[PDB]
Design a protein around this nucleic acid. Structure first.
Lengths: 1000, 88
RNA sequence: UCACUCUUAAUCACACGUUGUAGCUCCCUUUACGUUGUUACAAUAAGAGAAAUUUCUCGCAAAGCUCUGUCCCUUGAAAUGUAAGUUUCAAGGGACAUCUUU
C-alpha cells in the first residue's frame, strides 16, 4: 500500500536533492525510504550572468534593423525608377557621393550622380531619438551629434556633406566613424535639411528630377519609423470614459492599507475624496492618496516597493490617459466639460477606426468641427477591454457603491490537485529560481507518482537561491574571506597552544575567540580565566546566553564563554532573569558593564542584555526560512497540491541555520564530498525536522541547561545509515555488512543513488561563430581575416600573409613587440607609417571546418553540435556530428569524425554502415571496453581526434579528470550503447531506436 | 470577405484569431503572422500624429499607408485561411 | 565533551566590426595574384514556412504536454507455431523534443 512519508527537498541554483522518509501516525520518522539528486544547468549565462535570452533579443534587433534598411532601400529604388530617376534597379552608380553632394550644391549633377546621392541619403539617414537622461553610450552619441549640429551652423559648412568634406576628411583622413567613435554621427533633422537644401538648389539649377512630390516621398522614407458573462455586444475600447472609470473603480475597491498587521479597507467616508482625483490631476500618485486621506508613516499600500517618498511619490494609481490626452488636445488648439456618453463615442471612434473619414462619419452628429480638428490632429487610441459596452453601463453604478467584480456580476448574472501545477512564472522574475522550482516540481511529481501523496514537504533552500548574480558573487568573496580567516584562526590557535595534538575541533576555535573578545574574564561572575587551563574539559563551556529551549538561537550573538562554576546555579533563564536585573542589583550592573566593555558588536550586546523574551516570534523566526522563495513555495505547495498532513503547516521551509545545527549535532556535518550527491544530505535532515523531533530537541536542551544522555537522533545509527545510502556504490552490501544491528535500513527500496542530470536535446542554437573569415583559402584550409595591429601579438605577427611579401613590415613589427614586451597596443598606438598608414593587415588562421555565410563569400567556425549519430561500420564505431547550420539547411551528414584527415575525405557512412543510435548533449551512455565499464552522461565530441568526453554521474574527484573522462576513443571499443534515466535517478535501461531521424 | 477601414476593427478580433488554432503548423504560422502584423500596424496608425518630429502633412501621409498596408495584410490573411476552409 | 566553513529595461533607431565586387591609393612576390589606407554598393547568423524577380512572419531564450513525433514502462486483446517463442492491434502512466505556447 501507499506509504506515510515526508518528502525533504534541498534546492540550489543548480541542483535539487530529495529524500523520502517514512513517518508513523505521530510526527515521528522511522526509517529512510528513498534518496536522490537531480542536477540541471544554472538558468543563466555561465560566465557573464546575463539572461540567456538577451543574446537572442539583440540578434532579433539586429536582424530587424537590417531588414528595415533593406526594405526602405528597395522602396527608394522603386520610387526613383517609377519617377524615371533610376533607369533600372541595378546601375553602377558613382562612389564619390560625398563630393557629389557638395558638388550638387552650386552646380547641377546628372541623373546617375543625383540618384547616387539620393540613395546615399536614404541609406545613411542619422539619429532621431530632452537630453542627458540615462547612459554613457547615449551620452557619447548625443555629444557627437550635438557637436556636429553646432558645427553645421557656420557659413563654411552649408550641410553635413560639406562638414564631412571640410572638417572630417582633413583632420582625421576619413569620413565615416572609425571603431568605437560617434564624432561623425549626424542628426536626422540635419540630413533632412541637407536634402531639402539640395532639392531647392538643384531645382533652380536646371535639374528636371526635383519634384515637390519627390521631395515629400523622400522625406516620408527618410523620416519613417515603426511606432512602438456578456451578450453579442462587442468589447469596449480601453481609452474611453466608461472603461477607464471601470478600471479606476476596481483599483479603488482593491485598496488595502497595512499598519503593522492592521490591514484594512478604506473608510467609506474617506473613499469619497479619492473618488475623483484623476479628473483634477493627470497622474495622481501614492503620495496623493496618502496626503489626501488621513494616513501616517506606519502605513503603506499593498504591492509595496519600500517613508521613502520615491517609492510612493513616483507610483501612479490610475492614469486617465484618454481623459487628459483629450483635455490637452482640446485646450492647446468645445471645452473639457464633456458628457460621458460622448467621451465613450470619441474613444470608440479613435479605437475602431484610424482614418479621418471613418471617424468623421461615425461622429458627424455629436461633435463640432473645431473639436474634430483638435481630436484628429493629435489623438491615437490603441487597445480594448475584455468587457462589453452594455455590461459597463449597468455594472458601474453598482461598484461605485462599494462592490466587487464577481459580486456585482453575480447580482447581474447569477449563474487537478494530485500533482503540482506548473510554476507561476509571473510571480518569479528570476530565470534561475524559475528553473530551480521547475526541477523541484518535476522531482515532486516523480516522487508522488512513485510513492503517492506525501504527508509533509520540508524544504531547505540554499543561501544562494533567490539572489542576483552580483549578490552571489559577493557572497563567494566573503566566503573566501571566511575561509582564509578560519585557517588563520587555526594558525593562531596553534600559536597559543603549541603542544596540541593536531587539527582543532570547532569548539576550541570559538573558545579562543570568546576568550579574546571577553578579555580573558567570564561575563556572569567576572572571575579571571587562565588561557593555559582553557582546553581541559570541565573548565569552561560555550553557553547560550539566551537559552536555546526558549529562543532556538544558535547564532554567534547568543554564545558566551562561561566557567562551569556558575552555570551550575543558573539553569535556563536569561541574564536579566538570572542576575536579578529587574531590581537593578549590583550583579546585573556589573555584568552589564562587563559585556558593554567587551569587543562585542552592538547587536550581540543587546541580544545578551535582552530583558525581553518574545519566545513565539523569536523561535518562529529562527526555525522557518522567511525569505520570499520559502513563503511562496509554502503557499504554492499547500494550495495547489494534495498533502495528507494534519494542520496548516503541511509545508515546512526551515531556516538554514537550524538545518546546519541539526546536521552538526546529528553527526553528518562534514559528510559532504566533492561530488553532487551531498545535496541529498540536507534533504534528509530537513525531512527529519518534524515537530516531535523539535520537541525532543527542546527537552534535551532543557536537560543540558538546567534540568537521554546525548543529543536526539531520528533513530539509532542514523549518521551511518544516511552516509551509506547517499554515498555507497552498493548500499545494500555496505548496509548489511558494516551495520548488522539495524536490519530495518536494508529494505526493498534500497538502491544505489544515481544522480539524474537534466536533458539537453534542443535542436536550435547558434549557427556559427560570430567572427567571419574570408572563404577563398579553404582549398588549403587557412583563415584570412583583417588583423588589427593594436590586437596583433607576436604569434599573429608570424601567421601574417605578408612576411612572404614585406620582410621590412615583419621585421619592424617584430622589434616593436620586443620593445613593449609582447604588447601590441604599446607598439602600434602611434600611427604606423608603411614605407601610407597601417591599422590592420590581413592574417592567416586555422580553418578546416566552417559554415559558408555571407551569400557564399564568407566562412565561419562551427558553433555547437546538436546531435551525434553513432554508426557501426566494419565492426567499428563511427560518430557523425550534426551542428545547427546542418539542421537549418536540413542536410543529413554522412561523414564520421576520423583522425589525421579532414572532412574533405572522412569515413563515409554508406550502405555498408549500420546506424546504431543518436546522442544529444548530456545523454546517458554505457561504454564497455577491454579494460573497464563507464556509465556516464555524454559530454561532447572532439572533431579532430574523433574521441568523446563523458561525464561521471556525480562528478567524483576520484574518477576521470575532475569528474569527466576526457578523450575516450570508441572506435575499437566493445559496446557503446545509449540508456535512459528517470528524473529520480531510476529505471536505467537500454533504449533501442529503430530509424535514423531527419534533422528537421 | 472584403476588408476596409470600416470593418477592419470588426474582423480583426480575438475570436477570429483564436479560431486559427485548428490550422496545421504549415499554414497557421504565416496566417497568424500576417494577421497579427496587420493588427499591430493598424492599432498604431494614428501614433504618428503624437510625435513632434513628424509634420502634420507627413503624419497624414503615414496614416494613409498604415491603414492601407494593414488592410491589405488581413485581406491576404482571410484569403489564405478561407482557402483552408475557416468558419470566419 | 555524541556540534558547526552560518558574525529592470523593453520597442523604435543610430553607428561600427567583418566578408565580397567595383573606383582611388600604399607597398610588393615569382615566371596574374596578393595587398595598405579611403569611398560606394550588396550581405551581416546558417535559414524555414505560406502566398505571389516580389511580399509577410518566424529564425541562438524560457517554459509547457492540448496536438504531432522520439524513447521508457505497465495492462489487455488477435494471428500464430517444427509446441519454444515470435509478429500485430488496442488502451493507461511518464520522460523529452525536430511538437505547443509566450
Amino acid at each position: 500500500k501507499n506509504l506515510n512519508y515526508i518528502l525533504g527537498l534541498d534546492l540550489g541554483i543548480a541542483s535539487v536533492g530529495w529524500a523520502v522518509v517514512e513517518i508513523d501516525e505521530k510526527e515521528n520518522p522511522l526509517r529512510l525510504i528513498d534518496v536522490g539528486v537531480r542536477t540541471f544547468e544554472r538558468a543563466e549565462v555561465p560566465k557573464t550572468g546575463e539572461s540567456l535570452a538577451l543574446s537572442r533579443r539583440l540578434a532579433r534587433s539586429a536582424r530587424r534593423l537590417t531588414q528595415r534598411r533593406v526594405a526602405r532601400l528597395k522602396k527608394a529604388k522603386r520610387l526613383l525608377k517609377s519617377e524615371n530617376i533610376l533607369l533600372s534597379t541595378d546601375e553602377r552608380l558613382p562612389h564619390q557621393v560625398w563630393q557629389l553632394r557638395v558638388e550638387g550644391l552650386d552646380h547641377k549633377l546628372e541623373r546617375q550622380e543625383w540618384a547616387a546621392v539620393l540613395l546615399h541619403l536614404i541609406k545613411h539617414r542619422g539619429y532621431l531619438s530632452e537630453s542627458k537622461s540615462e547612459n554613457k553610450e547615449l551620452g557619447a552619441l548625443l555629444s557627437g551629434v550635438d557637436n556636429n549640429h553646432k558645427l553645421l551652423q557656420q557659413a563654411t559648412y552649408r550641410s553635413p556633406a560639406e562638414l564631412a568634406v571640410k572638417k572630417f576628411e582633413v583632420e582625421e583622413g576619413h569620413i565615416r566613424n572609425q571603431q568605437g567613435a560617434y564624432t561623425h554621427t549626424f542628426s536626422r533633422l540635419d540630413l533632412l535639411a541637407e536634402m531639402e537644401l539640395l532639392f531647392s538648389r538643384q531645382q533652380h539649377f536646371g535639374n528636371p528630377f526635383a519634384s515637390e512630390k519627390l521631395l515629400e516621398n523622400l522625406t516620408a522614407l527618410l523620416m519613417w519609423q515603426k511606432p512602438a458573462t456578456f451578450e453579442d455586444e462587442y468589447k469596449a475600447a480601453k481609452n474611453t470614459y466608461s472603461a477607464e472609470r471601470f478600471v479606476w473603480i476596481t483599483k479603488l475597491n482593491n485598496l488595502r492599507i497595512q499598519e503593522n498587521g492592521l490591514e484594512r479597507a478604506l473608510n467609506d467616508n474617506e473613499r469619497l475624496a479619492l473618488m475623483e482625483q484623476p479628473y483634477d490631476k493627470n497622474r495622481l500618485f501614492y503620495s496623493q492618496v496618502r496626503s489626501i486621506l488621513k494616513l501616517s508613516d506606519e502605513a503603506i499600500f499593498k504591492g509595496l516597493r519600500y517613508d521613502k517618498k520615491a517609492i510612493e511619490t513616483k507610483a501612479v494609481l490610475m492614469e486617465m490617459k484618454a481623459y487628459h490626452q483629450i483635455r490637452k488636445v482640446l485646450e492647446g488648439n468645445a471645452e473639457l466639460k464633456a458628457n460621458p456618453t460622448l467621451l465613450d463615442e470619441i474613444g470608440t471612434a479613435f479605437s475602431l477606426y484610424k482614418t479621418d473619414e471613418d471617424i468623421s462619419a461615425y461622429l458627424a452628429g455629436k461633435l463640432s468641427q473645431p473639436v474634430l480638428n483638435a481630436l484628429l490632429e493629435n489623438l491615437s487610441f490603441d487597445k480594448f477591454i475584455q468587457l462589453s459596452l452594455k455590461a459597463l453601463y449597468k455594472l458601474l453604478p453598482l461598484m461605485q457603491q462599494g462592490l466587487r467584480y464577481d459580486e456585482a456580476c453575480r447580482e447581474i448574472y447569477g449563474d487537478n490537485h494530485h500533482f503540482l501545477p506548473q510554476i507561476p512564472a509571473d510571480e518569479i522574475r528570476n530565470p534561475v529560481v524559475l528553473r530551480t522550482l521547475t526541477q523541484a516540481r518535476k522531482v515532486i511529481n516523480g516522487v508522488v507518482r512513485l510513492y503517492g501523496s506525501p504527508a509533509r514537504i520540508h524544504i531547505e533552500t540554499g543561501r544562494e537561491v533567490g539572489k542576483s548574480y552580483k549578490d552571489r558573487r559577493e557572497l563567494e568573496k566573503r566566503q573566501e574571506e571566511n575561509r582564509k580567516q578560519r585557517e588563520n584562526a587555526i594558525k593562531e590557535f596553534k600559536e597559543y597552544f603549541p603542544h596540541f595534538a593536531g587539527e582543532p575541533k570547532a569548539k576550541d576555535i570559538l573558545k579562543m575567540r570568546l576568550y579574546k573578545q571577553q578579555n580573558a574574564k567570564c561575563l556572569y561572575s567576572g572571575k579571571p580565566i587562565e588561557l593555559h587551563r582553557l582546553l581541559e574539559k570541565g573548565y569552561v563551556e560555550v553557553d547560550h546566553a539566551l537559552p536555546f529551549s526558549r529562543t532556538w538561537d544558535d547564532s554567534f550573538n547568543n554564545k558566551v564563554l562561561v566557567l562551569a562554576n556558575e552555570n551550575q546555579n543558573k539553569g535556563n533563564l536569561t541574564p536579566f532573569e538570572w542576575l536579578d536585573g529587574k531590581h537593578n542589583s549590583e550583579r546585573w550592573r556589573a555584568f552589564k558593564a562587563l559585556v558593554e566593555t567587551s569587543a562585542f558588536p552592538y547587536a550581540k550586546k543587546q541580544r545578551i542584555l535582552s530583558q525581553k523574551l518574545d519566545e513565539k516570534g523569536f523561535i518562529e523566526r529562527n526555525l522557518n526560512d522567511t525569505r520570499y522563495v520559502a513563503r511562496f513555495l509554502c503557499n504554492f505547495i499547500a494550495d495547489n497540491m494534495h498533502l495528507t498532513g494534519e494542520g496548516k503547516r503541511k509545508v515546512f521551509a526551515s531556516n538554514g541555520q537550524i538545518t546546519a545545527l541539526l546536521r552538526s549535532r546529528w553527526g553528518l556535518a562534514k559528510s559532504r564530498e566533492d561530488n553532487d550527491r551531498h545535496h541529498a544530505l540536507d534533504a534528509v535532515v530537513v525531512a527529519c525536522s518534524t515537530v516531535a523531533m523539535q520537541q525532543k530537541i527542546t527537552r534535551f536542551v532543557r536537560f543540558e541547561a538546567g534540568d537521554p544522555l546525548h543529543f536526539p537522533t531520528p533513530w539509532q545509527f542514523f549518521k551511518q545509515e544516511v552516509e551509506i545510502r547517499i554515498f555507497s556504490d552498493n548500499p545494500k552490501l555496505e548496509l548489511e555488512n558494516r551495520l548488522p544491528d539495524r536490519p530495518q535500513a536494508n529494505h526493498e527500496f534500497v538502491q544505489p543513488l544515481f544522480v539524474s542530470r537534466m536533458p539537453t536535446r534542443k535542436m536550435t542554437g547558434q549557427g556559427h561563430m560570430e567572427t567571419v573569415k574570408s572563404a577563398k583559402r579553404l582549398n588549403e584550409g587557412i583563415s584570412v581575416i583583417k588583423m588589427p595591429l593594436t590586437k596583433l601579438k607576436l604569434k599573429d605577427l608570424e601567421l601574417m600573409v605578408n612576411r612572404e611579401r614585406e620582410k621590412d613590415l615583419y621585421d619592424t613589427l617584430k622589434a616593436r613587440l620586443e620593445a613593449f614586451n609582447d604588447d601590441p597596443a604599446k607598439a602600434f598606438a602611434e600611427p604606423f607609417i608603411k614605407k601610407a598608414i597601417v591599422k590592420s593587415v590581413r592574417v592567416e588562421q586555422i580553418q578546416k571546418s566552417g559554415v559558408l555565410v555571407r551569400e557564399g563569400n564568407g566562412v565561419a567556425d562551427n558553433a555547437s553540435m546538436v546531435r551525434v549519430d553513432v554508426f557501426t561500420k566494419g565492426g567499428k564505431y563511427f560518430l557523425v556530428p550534426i551542428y545547427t547550420w546542418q539542421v537549418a539547411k536540413g542536410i543529413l551528414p554522412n561523414k564520421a569524425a576520423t583522425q589525421y584527415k579532414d572532412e574533405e575525405d572522412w569515413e563515409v557512412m554508406d550502405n555498408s554502415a549500420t546506424f546504431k543510435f543518436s546522442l544529444h548533449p548530456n545523454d546517458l551512455v554505457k561504454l564497455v571496453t577491454k579494460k573497464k565499464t563507464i556509465l556516464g552522461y555524454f559530454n561532447g565530441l572532439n572533431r579532430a581526434t574523433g574521441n568523446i568526453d563523458i561525464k561521471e554521474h556525480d562528478l567524483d574527484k576520484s574518477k576521470g579528470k575532475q569528474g569527466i573522462f576526457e578523450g575516450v576513443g570508441i572506435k575499437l571499443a566493445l559496446s557503446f550503447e545509449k540508456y535512459q534515466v528517470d528524473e529520480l535517478g531510476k529505471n536505467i535501461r537500454l533504449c533501442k531506436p529503430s530509424k535514423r531521424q531527419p534533422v528537421r | 470577405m472584403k476588408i476596409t477601414s470600416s470593418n477592419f476593427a470588426t474582423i480583426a478580433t480575438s475570436e477570429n484569431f483564436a479560431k486559427l488554432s485548428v490550422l496545421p503548423k504549415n499554414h497557421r504560422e504565416p496566417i497568424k503572422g500576417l494577421f497579427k502584423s496587420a493588427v499591430e500596424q493598424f492599432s498604431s496608425a494614428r501614433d504618428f500624429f503624437k510625435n513632434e518630429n513628424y509634420s502634420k502633412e507627413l503624419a497624414e501621409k503615414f496614416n494613409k499607408e498604415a491603414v492601407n498596408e494593414a488592410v491589405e495584410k488581413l485581406q491576404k490573411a482571410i484569403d489564405l485561411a478561407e482557402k483552408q476552409g475557416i468558419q470566419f
